[PDB]
Amino acid sequence: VCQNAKQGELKFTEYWTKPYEADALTTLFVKARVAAYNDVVNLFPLPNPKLTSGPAEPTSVDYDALTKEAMEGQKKRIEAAMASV
Amino acid sequence: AHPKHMLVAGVRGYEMEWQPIPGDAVKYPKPNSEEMFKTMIGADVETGGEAWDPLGFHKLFDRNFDFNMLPVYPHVQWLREAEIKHGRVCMLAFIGCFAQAGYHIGSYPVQPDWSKALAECYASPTGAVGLFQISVLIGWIEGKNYNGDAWVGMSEKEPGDLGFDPAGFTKNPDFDLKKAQLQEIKNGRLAMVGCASIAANHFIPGSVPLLTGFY
Amino acid sequence: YGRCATQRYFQVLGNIHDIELNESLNSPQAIQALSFGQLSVILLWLAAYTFHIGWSGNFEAFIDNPLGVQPINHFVLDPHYSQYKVDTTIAALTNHPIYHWLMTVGFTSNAQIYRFTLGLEITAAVMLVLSLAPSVGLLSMGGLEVVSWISICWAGHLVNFAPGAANLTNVVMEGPGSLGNLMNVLTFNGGIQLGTQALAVSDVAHHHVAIGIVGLWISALLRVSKYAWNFNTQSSYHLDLSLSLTVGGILTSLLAQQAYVYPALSYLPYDYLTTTSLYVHHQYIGAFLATGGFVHGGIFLVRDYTLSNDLVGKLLATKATVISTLSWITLFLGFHATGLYMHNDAMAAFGVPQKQIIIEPVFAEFIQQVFFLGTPVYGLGSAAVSSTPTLSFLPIISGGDFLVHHAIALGLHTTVLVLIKGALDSQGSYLFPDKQSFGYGFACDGPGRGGTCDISTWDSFYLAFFWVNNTVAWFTYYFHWKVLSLWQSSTAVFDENSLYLMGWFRDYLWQNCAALLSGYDSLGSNDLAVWAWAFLLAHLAWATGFMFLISWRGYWQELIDTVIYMHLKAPFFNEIWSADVVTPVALSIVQARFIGLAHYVAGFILTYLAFVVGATS
Amino acid sequence: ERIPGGKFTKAQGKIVATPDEDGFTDSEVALALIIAAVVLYLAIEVTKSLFYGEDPETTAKGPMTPFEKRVVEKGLFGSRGDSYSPFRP
Amino acid sequence: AWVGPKKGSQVRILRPESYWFQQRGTVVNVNQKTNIKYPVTVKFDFVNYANVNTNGFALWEVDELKEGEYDPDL
Amino acid sequence: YTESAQDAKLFETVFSTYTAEYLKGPMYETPEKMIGRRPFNPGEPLWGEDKKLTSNVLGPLKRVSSNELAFLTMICLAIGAWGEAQFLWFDPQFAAIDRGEYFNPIYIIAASLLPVSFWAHIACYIQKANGK
Amino acid sequence: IDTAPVTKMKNLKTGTVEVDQTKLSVKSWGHMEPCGQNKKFQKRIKDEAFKLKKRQDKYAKGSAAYAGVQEVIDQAKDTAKAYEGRWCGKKDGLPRVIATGEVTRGGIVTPALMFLYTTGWIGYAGRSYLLRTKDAAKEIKIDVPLALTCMTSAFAWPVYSWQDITNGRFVAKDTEIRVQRMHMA
Numbered sequence A: 001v002c003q004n005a006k007q008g009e010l011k012f013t014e015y016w017t018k019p020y021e022a023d024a025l026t027t028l029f030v031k032a033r034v035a036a037y038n039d040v041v042n043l044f045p046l047p048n049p050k051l052t053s054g055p056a057e058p059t060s061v062d063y064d065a066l067t068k069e070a071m072e073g074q075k076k077r078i079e080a081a082m083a084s085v
Numbered sequence B: 001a002h003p004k005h006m007l008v009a010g011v012r013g014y015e016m017e018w019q020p021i022p023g024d025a026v027k028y029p030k031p032n033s034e035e036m037f038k039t040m041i042g043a044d045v046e047t048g049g050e051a052w053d054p055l056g057f058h059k060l061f062d063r064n065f066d067f068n069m070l071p072v073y074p075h076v077q078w079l080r081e082a083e084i085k086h087g088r089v090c091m092l093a094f095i096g097c098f099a100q101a102g103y104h105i106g107s108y109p110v111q112p113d114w115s116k117a118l119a120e121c122y123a124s125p126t127g128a129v130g131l132f133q134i135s136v137l138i139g140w141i142e143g144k145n146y147n148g149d150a151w152v153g154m155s156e157k158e159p160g161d162l163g164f165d166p167a168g169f170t171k172n173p174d175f176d177l178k179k180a181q182l183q184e185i186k187n188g189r190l191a192m193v194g195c196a197s198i199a200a201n202h203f204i205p206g207s208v209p210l211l212t213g214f215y
Numbered sequence C: 001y002g003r004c005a006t007q008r009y010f011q012v013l014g015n016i017h018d019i020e021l022n023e024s025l026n027s028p029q030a031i032q033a034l035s036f037g038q039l040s041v042i043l044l045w046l047a048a049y050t051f052h053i054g055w056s057g058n059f060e061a062f063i064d065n066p067l068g069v070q071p072i073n074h075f076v077l078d079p080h081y082s083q084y085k086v087d088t089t090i091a092a093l094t095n096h097p098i099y100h101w102l103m104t105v106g107f108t109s110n111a112q113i114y115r116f117t118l119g120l121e122i123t124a125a126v127m128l129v130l131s132l133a134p135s136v137g138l139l140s141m142g143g144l145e146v147v148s149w150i151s152i153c154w155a156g157h158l159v160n161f162a163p164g165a166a167n168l169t170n171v172v173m174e175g176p177g178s179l180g181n182l183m184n185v186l187t188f189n190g191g192i193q194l195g196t197q198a199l200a201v202s203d204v205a206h207h208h209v210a211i212g213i214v215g216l217w218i219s220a221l222l223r224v225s226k227y228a229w230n231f232n233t234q235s236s237y238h239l240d241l242s243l244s245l246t247v248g249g250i251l252t253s254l255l256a257q258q259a260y261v262y263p264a265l266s267y268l269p270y271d272y273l274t275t276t277s278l279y280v281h282h283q284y285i286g287a288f289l290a291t292g293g294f295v296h297g298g299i300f301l302v303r304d305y306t307l308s309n310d311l312v313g314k315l316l317a318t319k320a321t322v323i324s325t326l327s328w329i330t331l332f333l334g335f336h337a338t339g340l341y342m343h344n345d346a347m348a349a350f351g352v353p354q355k356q357i358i359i360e361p362v363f364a365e366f367i368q369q370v371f372f373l374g375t376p377v378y379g380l381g382s383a384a385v386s387s388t389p390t391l392s393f394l395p396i397i398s399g400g401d402f403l404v405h406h407a408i409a410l411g412l413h414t415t416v417l418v419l420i421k422g423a424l425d426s427q428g429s430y431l432f433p434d435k436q437s438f439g440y441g442f443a444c445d446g447p448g449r450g451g452t453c454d455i456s457t458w459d460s461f462y463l464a465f466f467w468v469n470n471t472v473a474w475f476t477y478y479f480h481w482k483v484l485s486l487w488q489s490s491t492a493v494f495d496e497n498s499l500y501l502m503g504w505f506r507d508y509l510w511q512n513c514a515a516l517l518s519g520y521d522s523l524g525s526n527d528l529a530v531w532a533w534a535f536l537l538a539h540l541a542w543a544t545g546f547m548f549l550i551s552w553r554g555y556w557q558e559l560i561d562t563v564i565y566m567h568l569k570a571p572f573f574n575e576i577w578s579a580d581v582v583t584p585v586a587l588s589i590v591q592a593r594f595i596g597l598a599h600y601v602a603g604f605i606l607t608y609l610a611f612v613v614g615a616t617s
Numbered sequence D: 001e002r003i004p005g006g007k008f009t010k011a012q013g014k015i016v017a018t019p020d021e022d023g024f025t026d027s028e029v030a031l032a033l034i035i036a037a038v039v040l041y042l043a044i045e046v047t048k049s050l051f052y053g054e055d056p057e058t059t060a061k062g063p064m065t066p067f068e069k070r071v072v073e074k075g076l077f078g079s080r081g082d083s084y085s086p087f088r089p
Numbered sequence E: 001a002w003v004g005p006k007k008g009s010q011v012r013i014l015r016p017e018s019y020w021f022q023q024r025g026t027v028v029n030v031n032q033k034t035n036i037k038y039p040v041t042v043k044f045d046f047v048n049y050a051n052v053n054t055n056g057f058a059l060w061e062v063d064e065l066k067e068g069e070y071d072p073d074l
Numbered sequence F: 001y002t003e004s005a006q007d008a009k010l011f012e013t014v015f016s017t018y019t020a021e022y023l024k025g026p027m028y029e030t031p032e033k034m035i036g037r038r039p040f041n042p043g044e045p046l047w048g049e050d051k052k053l054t055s056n057v058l059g060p061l062k063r064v065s066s067n068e069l070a071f072l073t074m075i076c077l078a079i080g081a082w083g084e085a086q087f088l089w090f091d092p093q094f095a096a097i098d099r100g101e102y103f104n105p106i107y108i109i110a111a112s113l114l115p116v117s118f119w120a121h122i123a124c125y126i127q128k129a130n131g132k
Numbered sequence G: 001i002d003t004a005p006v007t008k009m010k011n012l013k014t015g016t017v018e019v020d021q022t023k024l025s026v027k028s029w030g031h032m033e034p035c036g037q038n039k040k041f042q043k044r045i046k047d048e049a050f051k052l053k054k055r056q057d058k059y060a061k062g063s064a065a066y067a068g069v070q071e072v073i074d075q076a077k078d079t080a081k082a083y084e085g086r087w088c089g090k091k092d093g094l095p096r097v098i099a100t101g102e103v104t105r106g107g108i109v110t111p112a113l114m115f116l117y118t119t120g121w122i123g124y125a126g127r128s129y130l131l132r133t134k135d136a137a138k139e140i141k142i143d144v145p146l147a148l149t150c151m152t153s154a155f156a157w158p159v160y161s162w163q164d165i166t167n168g169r170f171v172a173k174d175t176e177i178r179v180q181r182m183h184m185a
């Protein structure tokens, strides 16, 4: 009974006020999602959208290199986690 | 058990953490305390040759793991650091209490009484600058030797080991440093008792029957 | 249509403003539009007051003799009055400091008041226009910078209408000039200025310009602190709402305290009733806002929080410690305050008032003497006398104030205990491990597991609101009796008879009700008749709340079923009413508890308002 | 004329001085009523807007203003969040 | 082979929502069938709010305790 | 193969662990992970696996050296202490107001630098601990 | 037409807050004086004695009621003599309790110590009984010899309790007791 997803975890979904009606897959997914959020050392920055009509800002950070290193980090983290279990 | 996140204080599987200073890595302290106490300098003949710690103040850091799994109470290493610092400060304070009454150095207001010199130097335009310089120098020599991590028993330095040894001590093959440390600790406790006696005499005259005429 | 039950009313009306559940206008733009509409309503309410003050009121006669005239609120035209009552009543008098506020902010005519009403109506129209077009652009409006700018503009207004503004040389045109030139409109004298017996308008204007500038700087500092360490990890309308409500409650309670002790409205302390009503009203508002902060914190826990190792996670993990220690504090405070009061009651009853336990409030006396008082009143901590003292209305405490403050601490700690306990058990107790899946408010979990009445998180607020009202009643009794003794010059009847609770009855409640009850009797009726009638009405509402709180649903549902049977079996009406349309059902358990609490607090507020008016009239 | 009730009204001797005239005449009351009628019309418009909610096409078919575009892109003024917070910074 | 806690051995409950969470109970019997999700039947001295002191637990929700590695004073 | 209940629990654990380790990366794309909500800002990780603040926590002055920040905080502390002392006790400025003359702007500007010194020394230690 | 008594503040613009050390004592406070020479307290005592004498006069000489009221009068006289050493304001005359911490007549430190010792005794006796009677039967059915053994043995509570606290036998590890983790912490 207490393995149901919490309302905050199911926020903005159809099961926000009725977490007892969510699927087992959905409850497990959101319970893993909340844990994923609490690992900002490996959480991805999710770059800003390009909404302004002007040219793209040159910035100083390469999103491609960050995405590649995040792919590597995700692969290694998944490998280590599966080794643990 | 409980997941990796959501682990705080009393939750099962929560490793104890110690990170008070913003900018320093998290340190995970083991209980220790009693183990360090069993092999700790002090405990001379005056109390029977055993480590005189009634009230069990050195065991409270071990009891932190039982109370809330938080470093509320100091490690015995922090207790020795505090004892050493108090002893040195009280040695200097006793010598200052009995030297200010007879000597005067700077442009500070003439106040032989020790209980008023601090305030009168606060009020002095040419005393506030000097006390500010004293304060910044003390802060430098205190933050450089921050210890602090001794609160959880991992200081990486023996207690009272500031970067100060102009003489050949701690380096000569002779001059066993254990005896020197014991002398420092016991003279520090003696100076703290002396400062307490000075305060008692200042507040309750005739308490110590040797400083009756003292300030 | 309408084939629902009467339960539909109280089910939706309880969530009619729970816009997060309203999927249509769920966006934050709609919530800002609701704020705009609420501010339009506030502007129209202030326009109401100003319009009726300027229409049928004596503000022009008030500015001339603020001490000798009683402010008129509005004209009374009740058809139920008897010619005598019509001849008796002049107009509805004033129980709010709007005359004093208008006098302070520079109103000197009814034409200015009328222009103010027109401006308030136009500003309400502007607010409605802004609410017409919710938009992320309008979400830019607001911020601590905006409110600090409002403070700066109010400072400018007060400078323009300060009494010394006539002597002010134009700074922006002839330069700053001498210091006295600025002192004509900007001062920091500190405390009561004598005469008006209130803070100088120059002091208020200077305060506001300083507060606005400091607020601009603080907002900039907070936003650069958001530059590095940019973490909006937990955003929720209820978290921010709880923050706003707690800050507003603190500010409103502080407003009550510092407006009694440092009145900013000219000739306000001379009006006892308005001062007492101001303090009581603002303290009730502040307590309500703090309770709302706790409630919305609980709601954020219920349906917007995700467990983490954060501040809230740490609070939740050791919630047992928090609840247990708060329970210990409340038990100690209640035991000792009640026991000392009962001991004083016994000693005074047994003709031995000396043997009472009067613990001198030496800590508050020490604070007062060392930090506030400019003359030796108690002599503890310090005895220096100020060469150039400043004036204010800080009361001088005595033995009874110790017990009263301990009662206040008991009330505050018990309210916090109930609110914190409910909010932290919204995550679950061992009687209800899955409260995270049941929502903020629900009836119960049934008679099983021994019973689960009032186990909901909303029921925690329902229980704690009685304690909110009780705590506010305690310290408002304290304030009211203290100021009544000060104004009646007793100051010794209070200091002796407040030690025992029979004093609190006889000398405060029974004594101050003598004139209120004589509002109307066989001899006739005077201006206090309305307040005696409201006293009775409030008692009636309070006891109806008793009905809704004591008796629970099932009985009433069976009774309503029998009444429906009578209707369906009644002649001339079974052809017309089949109970299918808006079926009459008993109020749900949550609805019943809320309605009982609402009657309880309505009777509470109206009873105390009528008593305050009848005592300080 | 009033029958005074309450010890402080009698003690302080404050008199409820009725103004000789009314204070707002009748023309200015009519102007206030007209402005309140305009405010009432705006309130009816707001009530109709809120009761039926925001239509789904607006905020979806109407392109955001460049201010709104840049604010949502950079996460300002309560954007990049799920709160209102009028006292943001 | 036998899987799960031994019969009659004290176990600590790891189920967060159980009335006896982190408390101690005696194992009555463990169902030696792989399809049973909660085979470990544990008896407690304390009764819950339902006045029942026996409940079945999963294999991962109970921690078997040695004869002297727990606290006899609860 | 007559899947065990413990095998079902093992699959649930595997699914939860994989999801948790997968949603962290740039393959979930949720509003929470947007810059300025939960993540650490793209190229500026504030702290690593050990909870030690990196130089990125300082913002614009993320590359000002430890020695320079120490000098800045010490100068700010000295100037602020001088201004505070000269405003409150030595040549008090409120008493100067009582004399009818304005404040001395130097004292106020100096005393404004004490919280500057506070945050400056905190940033100085952050830089020193990072080797900057 | 007047307001409440206006109090005078200290326009403390000097930048320092001075706390007088000599005023940190009951004898140095200008609003409380010993009951012996407090005129209001003496008037209270006189009024009490007069009321007691008036009550006594109702009953004839030598009656049991007369003797009872006479004993009440003697008790009141002795109580007044004892209270003459207390501290009672300057306008009330009612003896006060000084909760600063100074050991004075009518202080709080000694009563606080006595109560704390007594109730630590009570709590430690109950806790010892519960620890040595881990059984609901012995809770409903008090083992009177063991209960009184614990009650009379709890006299050493202040030191035994601290020894158990420092040795880990007093508090329980948070991972070994029923703690609220239903939120799946």
Ligand code: CLA
Pocket: B037, B040, B041, B042, B043, B044, B047, B050, B051, B052, B053, B056, B057, B058, B076, B079, B080, B081, B082, B083, B086, B189, B190, B192, B193, B196
């Ligand atoms: C606050 C200063 C201070 C501190 C932190 C310590 C710390 C320590 N002392 Mg120590 N000591 C001190 C002052 C201090 N000492 C003084 C002034 C004396 C002279 C009597 C001694 C004499 C002494 C002996 C003889 C021994 C220690 C030992 C120890 C160690 C274990 C005891 C412990 O955990 O106590 C730490 C906690 C405290 C000290 C708490 C102090 C707070 C109390 C409540 C204050 C009460 C005193 C009060 C002012 C009355 C004054 C009494 C008068 C005699 C001055 C530890 C490193 C033992 C050791 O070396 O172990 C190997 C040991 O055998 N100490």
Ligand code: CLA
Pocket: C013, C014, C015, C016, C017, C018, C019, C241, C245, C288, C289, C290, C291, C292, C293, C295, C299, C440, C441, C458, C461, C537, C538, C541, C598, C602, C603, C606
């Ligand atoms: C600006 C402040 C603010 C805001 C925006 C909100 C907003 C909200 N609150 Mg909230 N609240 C606040 C302050 C605030 N509150 C305060 C200060 C308190 C403490 C008193 C509470 C206590 C509170 C509770 C306990 C609950 C909410 C709930 C809610 C949500 C639904 C509101 C709803 O439909 O209620 C419906 C509103 C009403 C039914 C209004 C009642 C009408 C009154 C009682 C009329 C009586 C007055 C009458 C004229 C007097 C007659 C006198 C007599 C003599 C004649 C909504 C998000 C609910 C929620 O989120 O649950 C999921 C909820 O359960 N709030």
Ligand code: CLA
Pocket: C327, C328, C330, C331, C332, C333, C334, C335, C336, C338, C339, C410, C414, C417, C418, C463, C464, C466, C467
């Ligand atoms: C007069 C009415 C009254 C009284 C006395 C109480 C008393 C109490 N309520 Mg309460 N309550 C009331 C009305 C009242 N409530 C109402 C109407 C509501 C609305 C439903 C609530 C809602 C409510 C909630 C929601 C909560 C409380 C809580 C509490 C307790 C707070 C702790 C405390 O003060 O202990 C002091 C206890 C007393 C003053 C009771 C009297 C005890 C004796 C008679 C007085 C002392 C005599 C003497 C010292 C003892 C002699 C010892 C020896 C010589 C024999 C306490 C038992 C809180 C709680 O239980 O936390 C612990 C809590 O969470 N109450």
Ligand code: CLA
Pocket: C324, C325, C327, C328, C331, G122, G123, G124, G125, G126, G127, G129, G130, G142, G146, G147, G148, G150, G151
């Ligand atoms: C062995 C007996 C015993 C012991 C050691 C404690 C100890 C404690 N209780 Mg407690 N309690 C007890 C019995 C006991 N209680 C009983 C019988 C009740 C039911 C009335 C309660 C109700 C209770 C509440 C409601 C609260 C505590 C709290 C507390 C804690 C703070 C101390 C306090 O406020 O005490 C105050 C004690 C009371 C108000 C009730 C005392 C009733 C009697 C006097 C105690 C019984 C003694 C026992 C029968 C002795 C028999 C010995 C004999 C068999 C040999 C502390 C851990 C508080 C807490 O959790 O704070 C952290 C708290 O809020 N207790």
Ligand code: KC1
Pocket: B105, B106, B107, B108, B126, B127, B128, B129, B130, B131, B133, B134, B137
């Ligand atoms: C060569 C350069 C030099 C000179 C020439 C010099 C001289 C004086 N120093 Mg000085 N000094 C340093 C440098 C110099 N000091 C350095 C590097 C340090 C850090 C280690 C330091 C520390 C302190 C402290 C802590 C104090 C202090 C003061 C005085 C003083 C008395 C003035 C007077 O009484 O009028 C005089 C004449 C004391 C004082 O009284 O200041 C009010 C005071 O407390 N100094």
Ligand SMILES: CC1=C(C#C/C(C)=C/C=C/C(C)=C/C=C/C=C(C)/C=C/C=C(C)/C=C/[C@@]23O[C@]2(C)C[C@@H](O)CC3(C)C)C(C)(C)C[C@H](O)C1
Pocket: B090, B091, B092, B094, B095, B164, B165, B166, B167, B168, B169, B187, B188, B190, B191, B193, B194, B195, B197, B198, B208, B209, B210, B211
């Ligand atoms: C460390 C170091 C160095 C150094 C050093 C320094 C600065 C060392 C300084 C040492 C110093 C300054 C040591 C003072 C002690 C004062 C005491 C113990 C006071 C006691 C006070 C007492 C005992 C009071 C006692 C009494 O009240 C009692 C208890 C009761 C009464 O009946 C009797 C009286 C009233 C008398 C070198 C050499 C420079 C280089 C080397 O390389 C490294």
Ligand SMILES: CC1=C(/C=C/C(C)=C/C=C/C(C)=C/C=C/C=C(C)/C=C/C=C(C)/C=C/C2=C(C)CCCC2(C)C)C(C)(C)CCC1
Pocket: C242, C246, C290, C293, C294, C296, C297, C298, C300, C301, C312, C315, C367, C419, C420, C423, C424
């Ligand atoms: C439920 C909950 C929640 C909520 C919470 C809340 C609601 C809180 C509040 C809080 C608060 C509401 C706070 C407040 C605070 C305040 C303060 C902190 C103040 C202080 C001050 C002081 C301390 C001072 C004092 C003084 C004076 C002024 C005078 C006299 C003397 C003295 C000095 C004492 C949340 C969800 C979020 C989380 C979870 C749980």
